[PDB]
């Protein structure tokens with residue numbers, strides 16, 4: 644009964660989206676074996692770099708984005724799980740199921756994105772495959788893809804950033820608005836709603 648009750652593992656950083664140069668590309672930093680083991684222990688000694696991490700649990704894989712010293716991701720990916728770190732599991736510092744949002748303190752080595760103050764509606768969504776997709780802002784939390792794509796293409800990218808032209812963070816990718824399997828729009832957690840939650 645009780646003594647046989649299992650614990651859920653930590654979210655584990657398994658790679659990152661490199662946005663540092665002229666070319667955006669994915670990098671894997673940990674394989675499946677290492678991920679499983681890191682998830683169970685919560686101990687992750689790997690070096691962390693950059694703003695957009697690819698993260699994983701035993702069952703799902705998605706993204707997480709650093710903005711103002713917090714690593715943010717989606718609740719429907721992370722639930723209330725801890726994140727693996729060099730000194731063990733780290734407890735969520737923010738949890739809000741109503742905004743589909745969680746966050747932990749940003750891992751040492753990560754770089755954070757600055758929240759946008761530009762007021763601009765020409766946005767760019769960064770996916771787990773390192774595609775930079777033009778998105779026009781359509782409301783507080785909604786944007787339209789300039790070129791619609793099958794949802795398959797966006798799957799696993801929740802937790803990723805929408806950026807403005809200046810590279811400032813505008814929002815965290817939450818949902819794909821689909822019709823007949825085709826995403827024509829996305830929904831995101833506005834950066835201002837992170838700044839309030841904070």
Ligand SMILES: CCc1nc2ccc(OC)cc2nc1O[C@@H]1C[C@H]2C(=O)N[C@]3(C(=O)NS(=O)(=O)C4CC4)C[C@@H]3/C=C/CCCCC[C@H](NC(=O)OC(C)(C)C)C(=O)N2C1
Nearest residue numbers: 703704705719720740743794797798799800801817818819
């Ligand atoms: C309402 C927010 C929400 N919020 C949630 C909040 C709490 C919660 O607790 C368990 C669950 C929640 N699930 C929630 O919704 C779930 C999770 C989320 C979702 O699927 N998000 C994405 C993703 O990639 N996720 S992921 O793969 O990386 C996963 C994390 C590892 C973004 C990309 C989607 C790809 C197309 C997949 C087809 C699903 C269509 C769906 N569209 C839809 O719902 O649109 C409307 C709203 C118009 C109907 C939708 O997007 N989602 C459904």
Ligand SMILES: [Zn+2]
Nearest residue numbers: 759761807811
């Ligand atoms: Zn901006």
